[PDB]
Amino acid sequence: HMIPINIKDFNYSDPVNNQDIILVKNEKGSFDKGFFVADKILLVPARYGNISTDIYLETDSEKNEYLKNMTTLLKRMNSYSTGNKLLNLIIKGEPIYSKDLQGKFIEQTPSRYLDTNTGKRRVNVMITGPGSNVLTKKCTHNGMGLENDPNGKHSNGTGILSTIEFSPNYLIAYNKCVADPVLTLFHELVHSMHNLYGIAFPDNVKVPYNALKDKNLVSGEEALSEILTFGGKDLTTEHLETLWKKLAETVIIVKDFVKTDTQAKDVFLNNLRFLSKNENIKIDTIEDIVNGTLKIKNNISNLTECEFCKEIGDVRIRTRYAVHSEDVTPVEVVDFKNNYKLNSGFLEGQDISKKYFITNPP
Ligand SMILES: [Zn+2]
Known part of the structure; x- marks a missing residue:
């Protein structure tokens, strides 16, 4: 069931050691302290x-708080089968090597x-x-988003590390209900x-009509990977077959x-083993591939925000991914540290209306 992941606790003041506490070179060419809370994260x-x-x-005090609060979120997430499973895939994955002009593969x-x-x-994911x-709140690759980068490494099977932008202290409420960070x-x-x-596919797919959004039986469209990420009712059995395909x-x-x-091929096969949960996955024949990717679809089909929410049991999520911007506060x-807890949320x-939420912040 649960695969042990050691999520490390740090204080911001802990010295740089070049191992799990490093200095990341940023876009301006200055340095920010980075903390490897887990392998490759x-x-x-x-x-x-x-x-x-x-x-x-x-x-420094705010940096320390951010570190503590984000680590609380990761530990909470890791307490649930869905969260633990996701983090394992993230830790274990390896973007495919690139080919130079000679057709030779390069690992670095x-x-x-980074x-x-x-x-x-x-690095597999940098959270900042x-x-x-x-x-x-956004997940970028090479400064770009899901639908921003036709034929990108995020969607062509080769893969790429991501940067997530995220604050746990500033949040959105959907119809008076603050999204749980x-x-x-x-x-x-x-x-x-x-x-x-x-495997971040941008392909537009139709989503079920939403009475309190759409009109005159004109349904909307959304990116497949987005629907997969959110999950719930918007994600159909057909969407999942498109995903298998x-x-x-x-x-x-x-x-x-x-x-x-x-070597390059072995990395790919390792990835497929992790995604499919099958040590014996093969890609020798079309049939092997079809069977292998079926296991992959099944395995990642439960890694959705709605599934995670269900598993937590005592938290609320909005019904549909699509919101009209008149419902958002x-x-x-x-x-945060006293009002949001590892075991409780x-x-x-x-x-x-709760006291620890300030509406329309300064
Ligand atoms: Zn999303």
Whole structure:
């Protein structure tokens, strides 16, 4: 059942050691302290990009709080089968090597490595603070999103590390119900998992009509991976068959790419073993691929925000992924560390009227 993951506790003041406490080279060429809370999962208490607006996360005390609060979310997530399973995939995944102009494979690539003050370090996901908007929660690869990058490494089976922007102190309420940040963080990590294995498919699919959104039986469309990430009623058995199909196509394509190199091929096969939960997965024949990717679809079909929510049991999630922006209310969490707990979540629940939520923050 549960695969042990050691999620490490740090204080922001803990010295850089070049092992689990490092300095990440940022876009401006300065350095932010990074903490490997787990293998290949780097937590960076800093703002993302150049901030000139809302200053949050500049002080040591705020950096320490961010570190503690995000670690609480990760430990909570890891307490549940769904969360633990997701984090394992993220830890164990390996983006495929790239080919140079000679057709030779190279292992040390920007898809696999971040720059640090001591040089290149292997990262699968970097979790860091938001940009200029403190509310931003987003999973990027190479500075780009799910639908931003046609034929990107996030969607072509080769895979790429992600950066997640996320603040646990500034949140959104849907119809007076503040989204639980463990659910939102799980959401973003599902995106990072898809990116890591190069299975973040952008393909538009139709979603069920929503009476309190659509009109005159005109349904909406959304990206397949988005519907998969959220899950619930919006995700249909047909969506999942589209996913199975896309997976099989991807494996066929990637097989052809790595066929020239044993090491590169072995990495791919390792990935397939983790995704499929089958040590004996093969890609020798079309049939092997179809069977293998079926196991992959089944295995990742339960890694959805709705499934995670269900498993927690005592937290609320909105019914549909699609929201109209008239239902949304920003909030600030007061004294997160005392009001949101590892085993409990929000101590008095997610209603916006609770004292530890400030509506329409400064
Ligand atoms: Zn999403």
